[PDB]
Structures are given as C-alpha cells and as structure tokens.
Amino acid sequence: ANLAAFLVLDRPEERITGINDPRLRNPSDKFIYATVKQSSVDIYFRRQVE
C-alpha cells in the first residue's frame, strides 16, 4: 500500500500549470524564471499591473 502510494500519488510537481501558481505569484531565490529581454513578453508583463 505505501509503495503504491509513493510511486503513484505523491509525484513532484515539476509542472507549474500556468501563471496562477502561488509559487510564481510570490517567488524566492529558488524558482528563477525569466524571459528574453526586450520582447513581447516583457511588454505584456510590464503593461499588466497586478
């Protein structure tokens, strides 16, 4: 039972599932994420105020 629970359910969340993850909402020194400098992504994030 416990080996099945370990190898089935509690899988590390290597996926962030978009930008609604509170880990990316409040980052730290561990999760470093970035985008290419001076591009549409930069413009979009700069425009959005939240």
Q: Which residues bind another protein (CB under 8 A)?
A: 22-23, 26, 28
Nearer to another protein, 18 or 22 (CB): 22
Nearer to another protein, 21 or 42 (CB): 21
Write out the two tokens for 43.
Answer: 């413009």
Residue count (the chain): 50
40 is in an annotated binding site: yes
Separation of alpha carbons 2 and 9, rounded Å: 10
Element (H, E) at 48: none
- Which residues does the annotation place in the binding site? 40
Annotated binding site for glycine: 40
